[PDB]
Symmetry: D2
Subunit: 234 residues, 4 copies
Amino acid sequence: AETVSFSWNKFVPKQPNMILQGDAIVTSSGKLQLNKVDENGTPKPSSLGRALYSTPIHIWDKETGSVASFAASFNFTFYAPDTKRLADGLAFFLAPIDTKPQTHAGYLGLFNENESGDQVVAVEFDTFRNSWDPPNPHIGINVNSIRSIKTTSWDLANNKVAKVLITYDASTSLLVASLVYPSQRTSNILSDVVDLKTSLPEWVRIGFSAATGLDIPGESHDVLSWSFASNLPH
Amino acid sequence: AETVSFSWNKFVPKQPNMILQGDAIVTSSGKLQLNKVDENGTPKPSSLGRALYSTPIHIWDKETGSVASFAASFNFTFYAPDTKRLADGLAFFLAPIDTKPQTHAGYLGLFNENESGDQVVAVEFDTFRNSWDPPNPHIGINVNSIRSIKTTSWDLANNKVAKVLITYDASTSLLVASLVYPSQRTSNILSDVVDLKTSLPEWVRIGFSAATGLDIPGESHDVLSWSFASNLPH
Amino acid sequence: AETVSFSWNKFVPKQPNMILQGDAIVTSSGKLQLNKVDENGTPKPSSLGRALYSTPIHIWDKETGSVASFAASFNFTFYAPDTKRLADGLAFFLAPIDTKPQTHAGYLGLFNENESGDQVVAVEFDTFRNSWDPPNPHIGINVNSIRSIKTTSWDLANNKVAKVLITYDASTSLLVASLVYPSQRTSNILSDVVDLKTSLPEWVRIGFSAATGLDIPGESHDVLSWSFASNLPH
Amino acid sequence: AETVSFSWNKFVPKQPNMILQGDAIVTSSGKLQLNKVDENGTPKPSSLGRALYSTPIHIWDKETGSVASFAASFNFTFYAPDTKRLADGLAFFLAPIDTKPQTHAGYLGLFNENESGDQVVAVEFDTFRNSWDPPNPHIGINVNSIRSIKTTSWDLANNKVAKVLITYDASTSLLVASLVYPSQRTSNILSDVVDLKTSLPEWVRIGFSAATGLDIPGESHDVLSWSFASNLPH
Ligand SMILES: [Ca+2]
Ligand SMILES: [Ca+2]
Ligand SMILES: [Ca+2]
Ligand SMILES: [Ca+2]
Ligand SMILES: [Mn+2]
Ligand SMILES: [Mn+2]
Ligand SMILES: [Mn+2]
Ligand SMILES: [Mn+2]
């Protein structure tokens, strides 16, 4: 086997094991703040921040044919000055080692209009209905496209902390995404199969991406903690 | 801290670390078969089997005031000769060290008519609507009563294997129960708060209980694997 | 695979997951005190206490032929009113589920004069030279006999805490025993091969045994903490 | 807490999570070969290869004052065409993020003549007696100096695989280094206290360094596997 793991209950500014892109920064308060915010703490429209764990992960082996199973968890929140006008969302994803930020707003920094997507697999938390979207805030599974292969309703709550759990079982190629609000005693879950061998390169970096509304502030997105474990078998 | 854990991908007949009650047995095939079955593999009505992990778990400390966080997973299935007439269900639970089987059928071997329940906490997978029940097969959280404190719809499927995950976070006293059918790419999740300090004794045994229909065969219930981890803090 | 593990930084009187034999007790102070002691804290000669983890461990599989790898750690100490007259020692061991205390003093509660030993594997910390012994306090590897298959010098220290680590690698059948005194910055290590398949039953209980001098007080032995992990492969 | 871990039973050429310096390469055979070798497999004198795990480790916190505990293991070997003329050795170490190779031969690529050492902590396996050295191959604990704070005899064996275990317990600041030859059923152990807070920077990279004899071939050094875990407390 080949394994890797990590856990933090907080971020540390300038931590050398995280790559930051876009507007993403880490506050003295230990928060990974993905989007730029006004004085009064008001998200600025057209913000785009990404953050990637520095060490590349070995996700599958062309030689042995093995695919890793993995699991990630995190806590996050968003703040919306106007609960009625949200945009655009947050995503957890896997991409090529040299991944750079893509289009903002509704493309969540991952993808691009008029272009087939890099090899990017993501789990989205989407607040804004684009043409390709279902109605309402949803959770989705994106496989090389911002046009989700499967979705589900996300009972979101402004300013409350959401506890997220993502899991991938190589044995069934089944990806599971669950989200829970302890404050609310509320919960959501989504699942589908994903072939990692056909959607990602052998080695990838994993991380976060979030965007504020194109022309509106939408909501800011902050990640509070992060945990992650991968097991690639012999 | 104080921890304990275990994992098996199969059961072994006569394994000395499992307590069996009722009709529960372990097949040569490595299945923990909770209910008695006809020649043709047809569940017998009024069957009741329970099985408990032999070592008692330390769930909370009256001295320090600490409460354990824990997590359990398992795979299970049921077989119903007649999909239209199911009964009664299966449960995962925690009870006092000296726990014995209670009433069958709709009481899931856990509880009793006309009696306040021992200190029993359970997560149920309920196939039969009793008076106290909501309509349809559901998943529930029972806290000393068969009358669930909270429920959710269970998209079940005859003969398919369900992958279950139960979690308890002392920090928020939030219990989470999730169930997934990889065959179906289908999933369900439930959550609520439970005060272990007021609902269980310091030490408990954890295990399985299932019942077939009172006067009908309902469905049989088999557990295939079991994993479990507890962490009681200083 | 099949795994089990546990960890405690202290013992709790009456803990239901420990079996006590002989004079062994657990103090309110969280110490597993193996031998009986005078008012003034003076060991009584001919004391014999054993303690076993309640759940039986699956050490090897006659069917699959697999053997578990495992690891145990603990902290312990002894007190000797007279450093010049020590006896007899302490042992960590594995034995049959129904193991009962054997001969005391130099037999460490494990074995018997004039009898071939049950299926008992042990790692000893031996303070008293019996006929079969090398000179000086030593650490040994006993395989069904109190006459160690291999030994090494133990730089012991009265009243100081020793940190012990025992490991078993099925892949090489190599058992490793290491002991460290942080106070002293001193350390000792021993290793040899042991065939578990030929020296123990499939299932065993693991635990501690200690004896005070036959006609002298020797030293008392206390275990402070215990950790343990086993992995039996498919 | 803050943790990180990893395990590999083999290296993969071009793996993106390892930094290679000097002559270090990874063979198709999955071996991390630290030193350059003739056609016939004969070490070339004045070889110097280092290899570092790419992600920086958080070893202590100036803010909280906490220091990590950690553990590393590995398998390694050396080949000596002439068992009577060995040089110079291998080391496991921790250094600053931007660590570069230093002096070769007896300086093990870590240090320099006439210079006080960077903040480098190491555990050495030393085959050649330099002026500062004790007689015979030894294991040592180097703290900012190639002049070991403590040493012990190393019962080495040409061409056999050694299994190494290094541990650091913040609670006692005690570093433990153990080495075992299963082929030989032979073992060695060393321990001393090390103040990480005064000998390393908060963040470091960990890795391997080995050197062949100045003017002689000495022995080659190959690392076969690597495991590592760190836990930095709140
Ligand atoms: Ca959208
Ligand atoms: Ca019911
Ligand atoms: Ca003796
Ligand atoms: Ca030297
Ligand atoms: Mn969407
Ligand atoms: Mn119900
Ligand atoms: Mn002896
Ligand atoms: Mn040296």
